[PDB]
Amino acid sequence: IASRFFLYTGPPHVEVAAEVIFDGIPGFPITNSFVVAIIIDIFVIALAVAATRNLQMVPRGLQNVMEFILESLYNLFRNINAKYVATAFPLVATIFLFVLFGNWFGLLPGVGSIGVCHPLSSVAAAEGEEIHDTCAAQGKKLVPLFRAPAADLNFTFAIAVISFVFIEYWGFRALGPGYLKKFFNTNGIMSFVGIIEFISELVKPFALAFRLFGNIFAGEVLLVVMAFLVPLLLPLPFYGFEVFVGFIQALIFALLTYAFLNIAVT
């Protein structure tokens, strides 16, 4: 059982960085995050059209799974605010359906291994191996081809800012000029709490983006570190925790977006 924890074949170190730019020969540079964003856009669109291409009674197969997921999300959002459950559903459904597969793509084999480059070999008396990389030649860093889309502070910041813009717009949509009434209303002590609530609303998109990016980045780095410590049979529970927490983060991103929208409208 534990006798097969051979570290004679393991990674040399733990490469950690933010989003790394791909070659990007033409203008409009694309990164490793903006190739996995495209690949997961393609996957989600293909999945949606496959579930949609034949819609009928008695769902079974891809259509049944899609209906179950969609109705579960609809019931979850309805429990918070039934008035806007359908007016804002596409945003807080695509957020989940995208972030979930973004987090689950980072765990696929080869994420952090295939790069584009823009026993005897391992060191002894150490618990971590030191086998070099294929593009050690030319002294390159082996820029990973695939990264988790949420592990980049650009895509996550983008979804946070679109969520914040949506919340602000549809709080302004039906409240009159009541936003100025919730903050700095000079109703005795209500002015201070209104200013604090305005500050909190301002920092909400930053909190969401930082939370999602940090969770996904930390999961991927923990996986790399556990692989470095012991290549096999060590990162199994950590892989399970990572997939669970990726699904969790995907769900609560949409949940927090809709909850903030509800607290804004009412």
Binding site: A18, P29, S33, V44, I45, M66, F89, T94, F155, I162
Partner: protein
Amino acid sequence: ALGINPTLFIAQLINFLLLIFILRALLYRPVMNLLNERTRRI
């Protein structure tokens, strides 16, 4: 560093908006229509 490139940020935002609209016109609307059909034809 953090690498918050405004061009990359705008690209991600545009891609996410397009995904939102494509899914709304392709997945959410037909599935919601079928759900309403199967919950109101009961």
